[PDB]
Design a protein around this nucleic acid. Sequence first.
DNA 1: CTGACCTTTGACCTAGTTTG
DNA 2: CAAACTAGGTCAAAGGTCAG
Lengths: 10, 9, 354, 302
Amino acid sequence: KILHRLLQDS
Amino acid sequence: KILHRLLQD
Amino acid sequence: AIECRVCGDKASGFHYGVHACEGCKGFFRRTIRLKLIYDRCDLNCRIHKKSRNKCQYCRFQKCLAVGMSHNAIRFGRMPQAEKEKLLAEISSDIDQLNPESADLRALAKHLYDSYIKSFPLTKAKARAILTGKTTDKSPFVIYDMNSLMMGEEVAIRIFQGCQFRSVEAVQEITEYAKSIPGFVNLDLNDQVTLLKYGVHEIIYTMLASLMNKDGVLISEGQGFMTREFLKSLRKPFGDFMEPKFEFAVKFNALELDDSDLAIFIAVIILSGDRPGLLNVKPIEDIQDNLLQALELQLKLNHPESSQLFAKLLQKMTDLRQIVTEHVQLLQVIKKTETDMSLHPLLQEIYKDLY
Amino acid sequence: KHICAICGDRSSGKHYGVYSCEGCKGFFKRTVRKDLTYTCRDNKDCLIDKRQRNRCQYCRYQKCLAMGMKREAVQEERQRGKDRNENEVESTSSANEDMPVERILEAELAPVTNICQAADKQLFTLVEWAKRIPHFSELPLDDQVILLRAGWNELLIASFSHRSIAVKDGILLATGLHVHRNSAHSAGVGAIFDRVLTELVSKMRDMQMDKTELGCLRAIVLFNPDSKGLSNPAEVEALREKVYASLEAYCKHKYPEQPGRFAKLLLRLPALRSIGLKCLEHLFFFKLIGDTPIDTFLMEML
DNA sequence: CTGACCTTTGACCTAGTTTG
DNA sequence: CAAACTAGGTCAAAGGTCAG
Ligand SMILES: CN(CCOc1ccc(C[C@@H]2SC(=O)NC2=O)cc1)c1ccccn1
Ligand SMILES: CC1=C(/C=C/C(C)=C\C=C\C(C)=C\C(=O)O)C(C)(C)CCC1
Ligand SMILES: [Zn+2]
Ligand SMILES: [Zn+2]
Ligand SMILES: [Zn+2]
Ligand SMILES: [Zn+2]
């Protein structure tokens, strides 16, 4: 749920 | 003790 | 990108009518420039980069069979290198480099490249820094307070010195994952799941690259902390690292290169045996093809390593083995201490983990 | 030329990265090569100087590590035959069956307080099963105990999680009880129990795990060379590689339509271990907590 | 077991060969 | 001749041995 951010931003 | 016994034979 | 006809490492050129390395070149010339007789050896030794300096008779003997000749010496240029410029195997590249196999090596190369751009310190770099064969300054060893004090409750400075690293690695692993054929296409909920459980296993695998029986490379690889040092810390933090060292000693024996580590890592992130997954068939799908790719990477890189593929997949149960055992200690800490300023990213990952 | 950074004596140049005296260079080598472990008798403080450097090895090797001596800078015995293999073939054409799959197969064919009843009852079975698995009995009677002590836990779980094929949302203890899912949550062990259903029972189930394949896996979980104590780990580590071989071939024969089956079968192993560890966790929590409902064979096992 | 003392390896550089 | 290569030589650094 903080990871959601790294998986959705490149 | 037990494991050793059953294994003994 | 040629190899040596005697041992293996890249050749340094055409020495005595054959592609030989600097070591095998000068071994041959030394055996001749000096009448040298090496007592027979019935055993047909396998000459490789390492074993090369074991049986002298078996080494010389072999390199005479490969063609090395004192009367085959040749200076000059390569007039028709163009001939043998197609790596003289581009005919088995239309046979071996295919069919439903040409793709496997294509997948590997892709990952090996995605791995190189994702992580700064690869096993390659790390082993030079460790074997000292590099144009750098010897890592600043840290075997006690004195040395530690020269960085620019202590047990804790170090403990949280790690938690800090993870965070950085996690960001790196993450981008690596986002380049695994089909990882983005998976349902965002399992994309996240696959990582909550992945990172840890991924870490100890990587982490073991910069570790030897005696210590571990730190801070970019410009520092080295002794195992003996860490092993001796505040009551609860002494054991904290042993398991990692034990594992690393075993994992390293397998001698895997970055090329092999780069696929193995992808196999871990993609494991359909994780809790909370929805579409398991998709995930498993990518894995199956990745495993099928790693199996070939090992056979071609370690032709003679018996059951390496099987042994490598066994280390996978030892990873979980660590991780859950680590979580236990991390659990203990919550009691015999009151300052758990563990980073908020580690909080997500760590909480709820089996 | 220089001064040895380890003891102070005169250094004959560089060795493994540091300016060492010929003495220290030889100490480091021998230590790394014969993979030795030294212990200190003081407080890891022993002083290293040309006179008293043999006074204590542990301290000396650490003085080495610290002054920067690198272990990997050491090559290994330029004098090995390094081939534990017998000339030509050791079992004509590998035999492939130095660990016969049939033998294993045969060997395989041979709320809470209720579970443990199965365990104990089942723990006398293991000596029987293992006894029947080839090359086990030819092993040192000590390593046999070490091997079975370190793995009864996992071996036992992987046995019934297969026996619970079909029988969904529940499992059959070895005696006869059909402990069903919801029947656990009440006891508080619903987390663990569910994991067994979902990453073992389930997975195992959708794979059609051949009763053989199972036994082949239990063998691999048995022949665990990492167990601490084996007077000889090399032998144990071997009997496992043999079983990797047998089972490995056994899929090429029986499941040719599935090339990646062998791997899929080995990946059931990681989960079998987490689940296994979490269980021990729920035993050293029911024992030291005086609830003591177990029997007798569970006393040496813990 | 240590460590004085002796043998090899092989990475790197120079001086001479051959192709274009 | 320049450019493209090699046989050799060199010396630090690894390896070995075997009285003490
Ligand atoms: C011992 N080193 C090397 C890295 O060693 C590591 C060991 C364990 C982990 C796992 C982290 S730590 C944690 O609590 N949770 C995690 O996921 C991460 C890194 C140090 C120590 C101090 C400063 C820098 N480097
Ligand atoms: C799995 C499991 C548990 C652990 C039991 C152990 C360590 C062994 C069981 C062996 C059996 C059930 C063998 C058989 O009869 O085949 C506990 C009690 C925490 C609760 C429910 C889930
Ligand atoms: Zn070579
Ligand atoms: Zn030989
Ligand atoms: Zn010294
Ligand atoms: Zn000491």
